[PDB]
Design a protein around this ligand. Structure first.
Ligand SMILES: Cc1cc2nc3c(=O)[nH]c(=O)nc-3n(C[C@H](O)[C@H](O)[C@H](O)COP(=O)(O)OP(=O)(O)OC[C@H]3O[C@@H](n4cnc5c(N)ncnc54)[C@H](O)[C@@H]3O)c2cc1C
Ligand SMILES: Nc1ccn([C@@H]2O[C@H](COP(=O)(O)OP(=O)(O)OC[C@H]3Oc4nc5nc(N)nc(O)c5nc4C(S)=C3S)[C@@H](O)[C@H]2O)c(=O)n1
Ligand code: FES
Ligand code: FES
Ligand code: FES
Ligand code: FES
Lengths: 796, 46, 159, 286, 152, 161
């Protein structure tokens, strides 16, 4: 029995791999339905322009073209805009004007994607250029172009007053007066403006769907790349008028999401409309260039970040104001009350008395998004802000920044720790982790080596500089308590339903949706332990809204906090009923029984026992008369708090100042996400997130030029490392359970990115610190680092 | 109505005791039932 | 004026009519319903579409089906033995946790299949360089290297 | 992603391919490995009406030494270049360069001739071929002619090839035994076209450079042969003064694009750095 | 036999049973049971049977047992939902459960009929504003072990 | 295989069939019009009934090749393009003329033709008129009502009760 259990803690090999290694995944574009058409967009060549005319005549006339939708078709259905998670609307098809390059203008539906592509080329759009706004710093100037004419005469948006037609929201939190008072008198004020440049989650599978309206039945089936398929169902209901029980959303296998696949995109809406109009299925699959340029970007925060400190390095306050570039529509995923996500975790791992955060979001002529790419709702930004600020403060203090952290950590006995911008951290042992990390990488030795190398550089003995990047971070994952976390009014719970069959195998479903994180493997491990049922005797499913209990989806590293909890809770409901069955069978009080791995034993008569397998059978075969037959349970788990995993990441980076080429020497990542369900899976999650962090810090970007052309939005330029560039990762852990979670498990999936980017960027910044480079804005690719050295006079 | 009477609301339920017309009939009258022999799978043999 | 092509895919004869412009990846996925191969990009970088074609690793999104006329192609569906047994690579990817979302996996395995024929006993640097045409978003490559090493050990133990 | 429609041809000989190309005119393109052309068809930058696939023309593939030259058929793949131990003996710079081109899949398909004929200054072979003083053998409807690689490139997608011609082979003078060589490329990642790259071949005697030739990749709208820069090395010990002068003369002829690889001024400097590093490695090999 | 009933945020329903119609109209009639119990129109309820992955375990349709067994389970499961809805209503309306009375499709406060929550509102509330003591959502299962046969 | 061209539900159809392929199987297996059903192997049940060149035909008792050039309507062809169910389809629902649904496509297709034969049939005429169609579920009474309903709908006036 022991071999077979494969429960919590096991490096259980993944059940998904069987199909995926054989090409028997079922991803959206693998779907083929009778009569299925293909739709795709005519997209804007302009960043900002009035649409004078759309001539679809030649496209409609092309053989194999079944429809060409424009805004004029959608309006009547009130679908020319769609709601966003941020409480704005986003244009589905451009009506009066286009607001970002590659914006959807018309949706061509054709026999297949080849014809559709042909017909797209035939649509002629007449544009009347308008003045482009790409610099968010200028968005609220008096002559800034009026982008969002559709909501222009609405000075209050979904997050309060708008003080300027390009101002989306202003959000503040923390004690302004106290913070200001501290800054007014602190010995040291350490200020920088850190830009977290726009990047993109770029899942290897782009966004896509197959919509199939069954007009006979009046039922819509929608396959799609949905991280939150139940939410999509509800939204589709509210905007289409179809009732939920007649909308069957299916998120099948998803080739990565990384946050890109949370929200709705125009493609989904247009495929649905097209299918409703035509009564046949419509597939929409975007190409990479459109994925990168029209779906959720990440980051694009300009963070004016200040720490107030004593000269001895006690941090007294943090004051941060962010300019958030949201692109043309605020489609920034977030719980509805949090327009800057959880950026208010930006005091990080440190015990500070007071802080204040302000965030302004602005519209620009760009794609929408913001919250994506392992951000945990702007926690990437928060952590970057603080971990960079720690370093720039340490420089200003002439202090080693590891020492500065150690001096300021929240201590383990302080948990649960109410941080000064309102989050109450669940558990953490930061000094232990930091020490483990520093000892493992030989930190003090590194610093001596670095000092020697710097002296060698100054003597003209080497052209390489060494940086030591540190990132000690507190994540906040598991959104979240119903009090404050909702997605458009649906509280951010998640769910599990577990049903034991007469012969003791199990079907269990959850309200989350994996996009590669191994849920189908790991949720079973939770159940296995709880019930003593081998993991392979348990089938896990997610993503079919008809069958899975309602949940809020997978993002924000929330699956383990929410549905993982629900899984354990539901399993414990089964266990409790099993105990009652055992008591009935064994003719003892329930209180006389104890659980022993896979059976209930009678206290003191350990020979008298019923196994879970026997109990499952009894629930069908000899159901106690007091009880219902069967053996199953559901839980919808409303978390009491977030989970707050943490990590200590150290990077050693060598940089050739003459070329700007940086090479990671060593990257050590300690993550503590509490109880570790599957160390193998966690390790993989970390490898992947660290690789993203490397990419973001060192190369990745989406840019716009002054005409609003989107730049670098293809794999010609968008830095996705190959195996050659990707560093080896050294991973480590500590275990500091979440006290409130049923199995003590915290989320982890986003941690590596959240922590990793500052680690890399800190290493680069640290390498050049002895040369007084100041804050070097990401990304730290070779030309940019060359420019740093050029401007420091290193090349002559 | 927007404020239907109790009786009106009950009637609209088409609940217990009602001669509610069958939902199944929509598909079955249009040959869109799905009976076993309607099933076709890739590679299926007989 | 579709072109008639005849080729072998996974050891089976295939005959089809294709437009010359049909990319091989679409022929494989859309016409042959061999949906293991994936599209990850529109610029030939990612390798998700990699198939083994006449002893070569080819990005099938950068070839027209008509160019594969007469070719022998293996796709991921062709890797498992006739009795169902996973190839060493497939097994290695599972054992070593070399996949997560699975989207790059077919291409990675197909590339690796050829890599281990090019070089049955590659070093890590050789592996990493040898899979440079294949992007993965999930794994950070480290376990893929392990998977390939594992597979090489298995293969190298067979004979 | 989706190309425009076209007709596809499989000529069986050079003569047939040239006849086709000549007949179909400008709307026809040769198709070699397809790994530049198909990508630009997929973007519809290129919308040829006809592709003339060279696949069936055996005489376009191969590597041979003829007189003082190595002659490489245009359809010889990168993979084949790399695999050739005979080429590695004679022209080891080629393998070195090829391993810096693209990725394994692309190298299985991409050909030396397509790399040379492409006219994207991103391609690596052009400047290598300029460095080596290669000659391109072209056959067209008017017969054979030879265009030096150094004379072949006028701009992005603008080359000396004339309507109806194929590049059939590249004829490369074999450097002396014991020559130094290097191809030094700076790029953002595997597969990326160079930020800058330099090809160097040089020979030494008595601790002094006897010959040197330098090509520069992707630092102008064409490859560049850095004639002055090579000349200035000759007679020197390839010391810092000599390299500085070569760098100056090499930088001076650059005119790089400002793109995702960085601004023109960076790329100019990187041409110099790649040059230096390539000369150093060449010197050590020599 | 058995029934599982799940109310969606917007008030429609998916319900499944461990029986299996072969023409007896279960997809119609089970929804009628639910509709009366919950005051959700039958048309807003989807009934399914027959997929063993999804339907709760039951013993099938034969012996004229569907109404005695799964019909009972349906009612009982629906009553579980009603009971939860009553708890939600009492929370929302700030009264005791004993202060509420059912009027077709809503709980009204006794004596104060203007104070009411409809089942539809309660379903949304169960997702939107789950009372702290309750789990979110609104669903139930019953496996019904009959006490006797029925003797028509 | 034989080459056939015909019209099914108003659409051209062109196909290759083996001669022995029963029309029911061509319709179901090759055309994927799976409304029509097979209930027997002796041509009694009528579940396979389609309307073929103005006739009610048991398609299990005809080879597809025999339908070359024919116009066939199957149950899938009955509803209007606007989604509105035919009078018969509606009557069958209104009058509870089906239960398992298995005979219904054939019953409706037969009845479609019956009502063209006799737009205002008596009960006896209806019962006789559907004599080729077996139903296990309904006991026919409501089928008669369904057909009466449909006729009255079509006719704009009722006839019998
Ligand atoms: C993702 C990616 C990364 C790459 N990275 C690099 C890189 O680092 N460095 C590099 O050098 N290349 C790189 N390439 C380009 C690659 O080497 C191509 O193979 C090469 O540019 C073109 O050779 P081909 O055989 O594929 O030619 P094709 O794509 O078939 O043809 C290219 C052109 O040359 C013409 N042509 C081809 N053969 C002949 C001939 N014999 N005579 C006349 N005209 C001819 C064609 O008509 C077309 O105009 C990369 C390609 C991709 C897809
Ligand atoms: N204490 C823990 C925490 C997690 N795990 C396991 O690790 C996996 C990740 O769990 P969790 O941290 O709860 O994260 P989610 O499952 O909610 O994944 C979301 C997260 O997943 C990340 N990693 C991804 N990895 C892949 N392959 N694909 C994505 O799209 C990914 N996207 C990202 C981003 S973005 C996010 S938001 C689960 O199998 C879990 O059981 C564990 O063993 N023990
Ligand atoms: S889909 Fe072929 S290389 Fe990306
Ligand atoms: S396993 Fe997800 S892209 Fe590689
Ligand atoms: S199946 Fe045709 S008459 Fe019975
Ligand atoms: S409705 Fe069942 S056979 Fe007639």
């Amino acid at each position: 029995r022991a071999e077979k259990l494969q429960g919590m803690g096991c490096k259980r090999k993944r059940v998904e791999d069987i199909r995926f290694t054989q090409g028997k995944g079922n991803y959206v574009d693998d779907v083929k339905l009778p009569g299925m058409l293909f739709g795709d967009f005519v997209r804007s060549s302009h960043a900002h322009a009035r649409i004078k005319s759309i001539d679809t005549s030649k496209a409609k006339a092309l053989p194999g073209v079944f429809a060409v939708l424009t805004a004029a078709d959608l309006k009547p259905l009130n679908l020319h805009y769609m709601p966003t998670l941020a409480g704005d609307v986003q244009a589905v098809l451009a009506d009066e004007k286009v607001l970002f390059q590659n914006q959807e203008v018309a949706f061509v539906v054709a026999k297949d994607r080849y014809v559709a592509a042909d017909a797209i080329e035939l649509v002629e759009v007449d544009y009347e250029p308008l003045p482009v706004l790409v610099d968010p710093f200028k968005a609220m100037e008096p002559d800034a172009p009026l982008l969002r004419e559709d909501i222009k005469d609405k000075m209050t948006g979904a997050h309060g007053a708008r003080k300027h037609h390009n101002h989306i929201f202003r959000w503040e939190i923390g004690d302004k007066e106290g913070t200001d008072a501290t800054f007014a008198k602190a010995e040291v004020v350490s200020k920088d403006m850190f830009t977290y440049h726009r990047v993109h989650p770029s899942p290897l599978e782009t966004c896509q769907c197959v919509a199939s309206m069954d007009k006979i039945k009046g039922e819509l089936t929608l396959w799609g790349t949905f991280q939150a398929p139940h939410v999509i169902r509800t939204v589709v209901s509210l905007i289409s008028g179809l009732p939920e029980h007649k909308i069957h959303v299916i998120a099948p296998d998803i080739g990565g999401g990384f946050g890109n696949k949370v929200g709705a995109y125009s493609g989904y809406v247009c495929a649905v409309v097209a299918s409703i109009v035509l009564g046949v299925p419509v597939k929409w699959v975007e190409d990479r260039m459109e994925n990168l340029s029209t779906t959720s970007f990440a980051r694009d925060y300009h963070m004016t970040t200040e720490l107030a400190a004593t000269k001895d390095g006690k941090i007294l306050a943090m004051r941060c104001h962010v300019l958030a570039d949201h692109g043309a529509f605020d489609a920034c995923a977030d719980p509805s009350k949090w327009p800057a996500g959880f950026m208010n975790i930006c005091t990080g791992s440190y015990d500070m008395p007071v802080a204040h955060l302000a965030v302004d979001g602005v519209y620009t002529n760009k794609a929408s998004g913001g919250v994506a790419y392992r951000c945990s709702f702007r926690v990437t930004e928060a952590v970057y802000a603080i971990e960079r600020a720690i370093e720039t403060l340490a420089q200003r203090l002439e202090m080693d920044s590891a020492d500065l952290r150690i001096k300021n950590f929240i201590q383990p006995e302080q948990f649960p720790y109410m941080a000064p911008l309102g989050w109450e951290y669940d558990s953490g042992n930061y000094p232990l982790a930091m020490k483990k990390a520093m000892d493992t990488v030989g930190y003090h030795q590194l610093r001596a080596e670095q000092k020697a190398k710097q002296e060698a550089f100054k003597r003209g003995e080497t052209r390489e500089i060494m940086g030591i990047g540190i990132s000690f971070f507190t994540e906040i994952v598991g959104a979240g308590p119903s009090k404050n976390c909702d997605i458009l009014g649906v509280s951010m719970f998640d769910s599990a339903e577990i049903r034991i069959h007469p012969t003791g195998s199990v079907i269990a479903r959850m309200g989350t949706k994996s996009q590669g994180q191994g849920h189908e493997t790991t949720y079973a491990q939770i159940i296995a332990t709880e019930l003593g049922i081998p993991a392979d005797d348990i089938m896990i499913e997610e993503g079919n809204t008809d069958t899975a209990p309602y949940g809020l989806g997978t993002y924000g590293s929330r699956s383990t906090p929410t549905a993982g909890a629900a899984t354990a809770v539901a399993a414990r409901k089964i266990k409790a009923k099993a105990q009652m069955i055992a008591a009935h069978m064994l003719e003892v009080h329930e209180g006389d029984l104890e659980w022993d791995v896979d059976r209930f034993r009678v206290k003191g008569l350990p020979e008298k026992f019923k196994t879970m397998k026997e109990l499952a059978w009894a629930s069908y075969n000899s159901p106690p008369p007091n009880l219902e037959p069967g053996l199953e349970a559901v839980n919808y788990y409303d978390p009491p708090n977030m989970t707050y995993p943490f990590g200590a990441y150290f990077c050693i980076m060598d940089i050739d100042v003459d070329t700007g080429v940086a090479k990671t020497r060593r990257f050590y990542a300690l993550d503590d996400c509490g109880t570790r369900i599957n160390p193998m899976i966690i390790e993989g999650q970390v490898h992947g997130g660290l690789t993203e962090a490397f990419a973001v810090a060192m190369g990745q970007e989406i840019r716009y030029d002054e005409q609003g052309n989107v730049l670098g939005a293809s794999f010609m330029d968008f830095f996705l490392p190959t195996a050659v560039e990707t560093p080896k990762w050294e991973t480590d852990y500590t275990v500091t359970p979440s006290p409130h979670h049923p199995i003590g498990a915290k989320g982890v999936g986003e941690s590596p990115h959240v922590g990793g980017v500052p680690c890399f960027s800190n290493a680069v910044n640290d390498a050049y610190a002895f040369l007084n480079a100041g804050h070097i804005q990401m990304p730290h690719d070779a030309w940019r680092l060359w420019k740093v050295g050029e401007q420091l006079g290193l090349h002559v | 109505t927007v404020e239907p009477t109790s009786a009106e609301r009950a009637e609209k339920l088409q609940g217990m005791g009602c001669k509610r017309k069958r939902v199944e009939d929509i598909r079955f009258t249009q040959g869109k039932g799905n009976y076993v022999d309607d099933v076709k799978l890739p590679g299926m043999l007989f | 004026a579709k072109a008639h092509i005849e080729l072998t895919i996974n050891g089976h004869p295939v005959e089809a009519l294709v437009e010359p412009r049909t990319l091989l990846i679409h022929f494989i996925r859309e016409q042959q319903n061999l949906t293991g191969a994936h599209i990850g990009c529109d610029t030939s970088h990612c390798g998700a579409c990699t198939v083994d074609l006449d002893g070569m690793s080819v990005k099938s999104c950068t070839m027209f089906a008509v160019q594969a006329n007469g070719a022998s192609i293996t796709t991921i569906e062709g890797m498992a033995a006739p009795d169902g047994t996973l190839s060493a690579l497939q097994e290695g990817f599972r054992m070593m946790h070399g996949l997560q979302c699975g989207y790059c996996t077919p291409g990675m395995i197909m590339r690796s299949h050829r890599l281990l024929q090019e070089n049955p006993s590659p070093t890590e640097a050789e592996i990493r360089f040898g899979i440079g045409g294949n992007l993965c978003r999930c794994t950070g490559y480290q376990n893929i290297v392990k998977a390939i090493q594992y597979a090489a050990a298995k293969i190298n133990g067979v004979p | 992603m989706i190309p425009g429609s076209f007709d596809y041809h499989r000529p069986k000989s050079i003569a047939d391919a040239v006849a086709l190309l000549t007949k179909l005119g400008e709307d026809a393109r040769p198709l070699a490995g397809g790994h530049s052309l198909i990508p630009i068809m997929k973007t519809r930058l290129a919308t040829p009406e006809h592709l003339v696939d060279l696949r069936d023309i055996g005489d376009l593939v191969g590597i041979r030494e003829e007189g003082t030259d190595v002659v490489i058929g245009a359809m010889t793949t990168q993979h084949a270049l790399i695999g050739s131990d005979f080429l590695a003996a004679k022209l080891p710079i080629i393998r070195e360069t090829s391993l810096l081109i693209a990725d394994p899949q692309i190298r299985y398909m991409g050909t030396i001739g397509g790399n040379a004929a492409n006219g994207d200054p991103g391609n690596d072979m052009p400047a290598l071929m300029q460095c080596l003083g290669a000659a391109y053998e072209l056959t067209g409807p008017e017969g054979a002619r030879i265009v030096a690689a150094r004379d072949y490139y006028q701009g992005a997608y603008f080359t000396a090839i004339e309507p109806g011609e194929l590049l059939t082979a590249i004829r490369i003078p074999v450097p002396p035994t014991g020559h130094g060589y290097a191809y030094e490329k700076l790029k953002r990642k595997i597969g990326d076209y160079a930020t800058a790259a330099a090809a160097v071949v040089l020979t030494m005697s008595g601790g002094k450079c006897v010959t040197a030739s330098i090509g520069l990749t992707n630092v102008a709208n064409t490859p560049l042969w850095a004639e002055e820069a090579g000349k200035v090395l000759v007679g020197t010990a390839l010391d810092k003064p000599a390299l500085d002068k070569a760098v100056a003369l090499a930088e001076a002829i650059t005119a790089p694009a400002s793109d995702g690889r960085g601004p023109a001024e960076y790329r100019t400097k990187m041409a110099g750095v790649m040059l230096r590093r390539a000369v150093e490695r060449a010197k050590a090999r020599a």
